Write a protein that binds this ligand. Structure first.
Ligand SMILES: NC(=S)c1ccc[n+]([C@@H]2O[C@H](COP(=O)([O-])OP(=O)(O)OC[C@H]3O[C@@H](n4cnc5c(N)ncnc54)[C@H](O)[C@@H]3O)[C@@H](O)[C@H]2O)c1
Ligand SMILES: NC(=S)c1ccc[n+]([C@@H]2O[C@H](COP(=O)([O-])OP(=O)(O)OC[C@H]3O[C@@H](n4cnc5c(N)ncnc54)[C@H](O)[C@@H]3O)[C@@H](O)[C@H]2O)c1
Ligand SMILES: NC(=S)c1ccc[n+]([C@@H]2O[C@H](COP(=O)([O-])OP(=O)(O)OC[C@H]3O[C@@H](n4cnc5c(N)ncnc54)[C@H](O)[C@@H]3O)[C@@H](O)[C@H]2O)c1
Ligand SMILES: NC(=S)c1ccc[n+]([C@@H]2O[C@H](COP(=O)([O-])OP(=O)(O)OC[C@H]3O[C@@H](n4cnc5c(N)ncnc54)[C@H](O)[C@@H]3O)[C@@H](O)[C@H]2O)c1
Lengths: 466, 464, 466, 465
């Protein structure tokens, strides 16, 4: 039999954040659609408004909360399904990483259903505690785009295979703005490609990590590339749902009256009924078809008022998180990073409208997140004259011996959107780690058996050390 | 045969920084006291005035400078002695660590003679580029007391056995201030227990790392102390860091070298060829240290206007590193020394303190500089019972304050027995790991499906 | 007779910055078009790349340079015209302020011809020294949008009447981007409404200062408004001209061969020929006609390449510099500032596309600069449904007694874009000083003749002090 | 008739901070010692633990508090005496400055009795909010109390022009210099600083101070101008710390001990002052008590079961330096030297002259030195040292070759042997040094050679006017 545990998001102070979905699941079980005994549905509550509490702290506390309440039930063979919202996803994923990484088959969790999870962060976190209010400062450090902590967790997750270990994981999210909750001085709260809080691409656990490492001898720079990708995970963009709120909040808006027709309740029930690789994979495809339908139907939105009418265009988007490092363990903080396109990989040739947002992490200036319009990029680049080309160029500083005796050579990376080995996918994040060679001029240290003392020159030799 | 390589200190722009010692060593070899062929004495020069250059960079560049110039001689069997001054010591130790840590026996270096090395940092580094000029910011990051980089290098060196691998390493330093070069606005330039730039205790490669890990509703402490292998250590008389007057290497001339302590003892160090020869020199230099520090204990300087008395005892340096068991460096804490039968923070001997500095890049790094002779004399008395200890209060300190918090740590020790943590002329590294306590309220689950406000009230019980 | 002194801009290291215009003016005098003796055209050179040198320093040093070189000529009755570029404008205006503020009739300057002057700052200055390279840090503090120093100078200049004192002042600028010099990672270098460095609106010496002062006891918050405007100054937006460069730089591109047909050279000669109020006002109107013609003709720009075609739309823009203070001498650093529109003055009703940029000064967080599309604002607000309404709402924090015992009441200002008393004009900056009342609850200090000692409560009374 | 208003210090949360002194005064009045009607003794309470509230806010609120409670009594001729503790002194002085500066005769206050007031700041304020509550306080008040604060400078510069006595306002400062050694914070040694009561330095309580202006002209020359406050009664009472029921200057007063308590005794005297002649006699009496107290407390021996401590307390001076130039800048990059001896060397100060230095965190041109006056005087006023004492200021950049805008060194030569000295035991001296900002002529040149050329930054060696 199944236990269900609800886990909420950040800045929550009341378990009504779960709407009435717990009570509904209870009733569905009584109707034979789920095998949940009365008393096996649990509401989680964790503290998100304490500046001292870290995500590590919360994930450790969940392990304790589980043992304190259902240790007997787990010993008797029961496994639980977690239904998470917002930060709840990352926290449960961290708990899995802390206690079961190399051993998912013994994890007492059977289903992970993440609702609008901030798996690759929220652009709002950087706005900080004062403006955002409420949220705890340490959890905002995790949620900040480009966070070193989310990078570490998500790099660890590249190696996971939940499905093969009998753990069925799902991401469901929406991309509707509840336009009554638009903060006019913080336009992230209405950002296209988001639900007001998390970007669709930042919810998706289908992502890649691309490592580009600079090589070279005496002469010119070369680039070795390696891409690794997470295992497939169910991913669905459901229609008409925002992050929060009783109107169209992805979970907040569920009631006993509307649940039967509520996309979230409908698909959560399906997810929980998965018991096999075959059933999982059918739901993967079903949710992908729903995604395609949702995003076509919501592409254009017309909002009518007594005074004005607005048109809103919602395409599909990609998020790049760049990590700039060198081969001596430094994060690079002084650099220019270019996208390039066209037959000559020009920084001036990107399709007009490619850009939505950029943000640089406040704790690590080597972490830079770009948010791009995938459909505008693909349409403009995959033409005869543009040849499908897409690339990066990174210029780190100092750039030559004449400026400093330690310096970096420019890196160029040439790719394509015209084949299946591409680095951008709609509704996905890609993590890009660029490692430059730290070049040190031989003048940094010379020895000479001329014993006549002399002034020490800083003039470069023009030849780097090994 | 022997090759010699000179390696200078920070902010140097001219190889006259070496005085005339290279030419003197060349003459000593012709007289038969050394086996150095003409042309096998090398002057090292590196860039310490470039803000982009790191100690990692310089040590890597040393490897290339060596290969570029004497690769042939090293294949032909020759090994080299490095004579370093100031940061040159750490730099050569970093090179050894990058290229030979697990294989010192293959290291082409046979002798490491460090003159006034900033092995555990310089208090002046924090004063920073502008005030100190000139020096390069990244090297100052390394030299800053409590630096994460020097800690990492010196923690690595706990495992070295240079002598066992045929590498004979020596530290020589002085503790005389050149009083013509006192910066009245920056009194570190005349600090007792230093030569104006480096503290005697900060040069010594004889040091311990003491780990104190909190365990446990009752707080306990597990202590573990590890110590470097013995290295030759000599405090030479009448020598300051730099300058032609009494600079430890700068003042050496062809005329005075035969009477100059640095030249005399460097020649002895170079002649060491065996464990037995090495150990003889360890003892001799220790005797010279004891003699120097007694003779220089009281210094009288009289001018036409006034007469100053300067007292110089012997000193100990503590570098504290405060962390927790979840990978955090701790930044909000109070650290107490304690003494007396009750381990009171109010009972330290009067005059025990010289200095404290907190690292600007890592606030979990705190360096105390103490007068060992005042401490020992006040603590090892009948009424004080020899007690010395630490108390650390990290914040937040309780559930009601925050749902993640720390319990006080108390460590109780003694200066009365051989297992003591403080030694004269030594730095001690103290890593204290507290347990991060998280109250169970941080996460609860309930099968009461009736929604309700979430309370932050502590349970008073911590999670595993 | 006339002396001419050229004065360059920031980051300049070579007097070829002036093009060949000095040599050309020399020949126009020899042909009887100007009254400039041989040897009475001077090239100014000042140091813009020293981090210790201030705008105050440079204006003081200009005075010394003039006395060192032409004191005798000035004693004999000669006066000089300054032709300035970029920062040179602000610098000569500071010199006028330091030495002749209350006394412009004694000023030895007869004409001030400012070419693309950064009179209200440059958005690029905040990007700082490293990224911009070169430029001196203290001059960048002046040029920064919202700078306290430029505010002080320009508030002083509200009281000037150059024309009445026989000083003929002119601003000429362009709004063409030299698209060869677009920095892809810093899009200010191609900002619509700018020449790549200075926004048209930031060059204009026709501007207003609007003071909004909050009044009211307990009960109702009310606002007293006072607007002051500079005297009219000649202002022209010339066609086809960018900030810099030999291609189309407003002064750099002038050669002996093209000068006769070069807009800058042609209109400089007209300005130098002004000798009276009547000729000045004639030129004011002629240049306004040129501005209207330029901005219609350049409204749409099509750039064709072998690979793609770009369309660029340039309207007319307004810049607002907000200064937030209170009645006790504090700059406010914690506030939300809203534009409002529609019949209900809603922050949600602004015309779509109204916004170009916002910047907050790094030295004074009470200084906030918005850059707006005037033509989109006007077209959307001046409709039957929108009634012409435009307003401000300022929410400063803390906002109530319950949050802090010293707090601020919200301020609302209601205006119109349909009257001649409007606060926005195309191609103009408006300075908006908002002064809020600092409310202090009576609990901050009480006295009682009950001598029984008791704990001190911080509970607000709900009544403020006088 | 007299009204008495009690005003407390910072971080206070309970009106027992006043000890039993208000009740004792009431009892004293019921016996004829004072003419205070029953009901005319008021306890003041203000908020010091709110980060948004400033000293300006508190002084404004004091005015409202007074009008709200005793407006009728003041309209009918009554005037009040303020008995203040710690920050209460500066607060009441700010209220006087806001509402009565050039009109003290109309001020309803008749007596200002300041107990251990932080008139020139507290060294502890820089330690900030988190650290101080562990030894709570509102950040904006700490900005006022910080040594070298721009706000205290402004109030105390304004007070140079006051003459309370001439306007019928009788002002007094009483303080102590005893450490309550049970409340020593081992990691923050300011809490036991010699020359202080654990919170405020005696020299920082004193309203007898000077402002010395040194303006550079020009070789460099220096014009000096010293202005001094009017005499104010100043007494250092024996055996009294800042706070605590043990020996706290006001906290330790009880009905039982008040008759023998130095604070109650001398407060009563101060309140009874009704004339210039009575005031001046009290000034001299209090100065005698100061000399006695500081002689009797010069040496303190503290004995325990484990050890014995000797503590030496001399008399101290505090210098607050303010470095500016003639163009409105505060200087942030400089070296400041004291100098002594026949050649005004920075190496010739008497050994032990120094206690403390602190630089303001909001204005790096504000530097506070705390010096041992008795050590300074004894070492400088000798035949070989000639009584010399001076300042040298080296601001940066210091030459054309370093920067085209730069400063020339300033040297000021003075003496501790004459009556016009700048240092006084138990006093603060504010020193404003204004340097000439020198700008090399290369910063702007004009030339009628129309051949374009590179712009040289080489300095000319001649400055602009
Ligand atoms: N603020 C939102 S929702 C937003 C939207 C899109 C991109 N970004 C990026 O996210 C990062 C941080 O955004 P940001 O801090 O808003 O940056 P931004 O550069 O827009 O603003 C800088 C500062 O000015 C403040 N400010 C701006 N406008 C107002 C206003 N009307 N009233 C009051 N204060 C104002 C703002 O709160 C912040 O402290 C930057 O990289 C932005 O480019 C932010
Ligand atoms: N400066 C030296 S040599 C010194 C000596 C002993 C201990 N320490 C410790 O080292 C750390 C840094 O020293 P610090 O920055 O000098 O600290 P300190 O607190 O003494 O000085 C604070 C600031 O004021 C400046 N300042 C102080 N006196 C003067 C003066 N006479 N002229 C100009 N500026 C002045 C000083 O340069 C610094 O920027 C602190 O932890 C000190 O306690 C420093
Ligand atoms: N930078 C230009 S030209 C620009 C354009 C429009 C508005 N603004 C506003 O001006 C202010 C300062 O702009 P900003 O500092 O660029 O803020 P922004 O929020 O765009 O960038 C934050 C930081 O990220 C850095 N960064 C962003 N993208 C890249 C990249 N591709 N390569 C390297 N570093 C990158 C950038 O240099 C800065 O240090 C903010 O208020 C912006 O919203 C700037
Ligand atoms: N702290 C006191 S009471 C004190 C005494 C005399 C002079 N001063 C001057 O006042 C200014 C500020 O003093 P400061 O912040 O103490 O400067 P200091 O330079 O002594 O300390 C630097 C930093 O290290 C911290 N620190 C030092 N010792 C310990 C310890 N045992 N446990 C935990 N943390 C420690 C201290 O809190 C501070 O954040 C400086 O100019 C000092 O020289 C302070």
């Amino acid at each position: 039999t199944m236990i269900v545990i609800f886990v909420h998001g950040w800045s929550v102070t009341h378990t009504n954040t779960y709407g009435e979905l717990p009570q509904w699941l209870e009733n569905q079980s009584k109707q034979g659609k789920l095998d949940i005994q009365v008393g096996n549905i649990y509401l989680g509550r964790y503290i998100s408004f304490d500046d001292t509490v870290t995500v590590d702290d919360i994930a450790r506390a969940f392990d304790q909360a589980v043992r304190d309440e259902i240790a007997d039930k787990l010993r008797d063979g029961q496994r639980f399904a977690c239904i998470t919202h917002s930060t709840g996803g990352p926290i449960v994923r961290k708990w899995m990483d802390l206690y079961f990484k190399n051993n998912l088959a013994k994890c007492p969790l059977s289903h992970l259903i993440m609702l609008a999870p901030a798996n690759h962060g929220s652009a709002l976190a950087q706005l900080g505690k004062s403006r955002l209010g409420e949220p705890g400062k340490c959890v905002l450090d995790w949620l900040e785009l480009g966070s070193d902590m989310s990078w570490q967790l998500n790099e660890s997750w590249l190696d996971y295979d939940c499905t093969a270990n009998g753990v069925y994981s799902f991401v469901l999210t929406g991309q509707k703005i509840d336009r009554q909750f638009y903060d006019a001085v913080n336009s992230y709260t209405g950002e296209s490609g988001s639900n007001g809080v998390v970007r669709v691409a930042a919810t998706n656990m289908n992502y890649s990590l691309l490592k580009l490492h600079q090589e070279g001898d005496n002469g010119e720079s070369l680039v070795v590339a390696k891409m690794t990708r997470t295992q497939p995970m169910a991913f669905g963009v459901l229609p008409g749902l925002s992050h929060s709120g009783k109107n169209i909040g992805i979970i907040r808006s569920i009631t006993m009256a509307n649940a039967a027709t509520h996309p979230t309740a409908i698909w959560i029930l399906r997810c929980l009924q998965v018991k096999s690789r075959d059933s999982y994979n059918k739901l993967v495809k079903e949710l992908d078809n729903i995604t395609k339908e949702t995003q076509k139907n919501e592409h254009k939105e017309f909002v009518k008022t007594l005074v004005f009418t607005r048109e809103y265009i919602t395409n599909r988007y990609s998020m790049i998180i760049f990590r700039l490092i060198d081969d001596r363990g430094n994060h690079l903080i002084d650099y220019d990073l270019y996208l390039t396109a066209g037959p000559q990989y020009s920084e001036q040739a990107l399709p007009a409208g490619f850009f939505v947002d950029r943000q640089r992490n406040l704790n690590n200036r080597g972490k830079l997140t770009y948010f791009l319009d995938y459909d505008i990029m693909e349409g403009g680049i995959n033409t005869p004259k543009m040849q499908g080309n897409l690339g990066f160029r990174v210029k780190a500083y100092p750039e030559s011996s004449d400026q400093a005796l330690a310096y970096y050579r420019l890196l160029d990376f040439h790719s394509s959107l015209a084949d299946i080995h591409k680095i951008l996918h709609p509704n996905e994040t890609v993590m890009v780690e660029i490692m430059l060679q730290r070049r040190v001029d031989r003048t940094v240290f010379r020895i000479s058996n001329n014993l006549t003392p002399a002034k020490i020159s800083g003039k470069p030799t023009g030849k780097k050390i090994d």
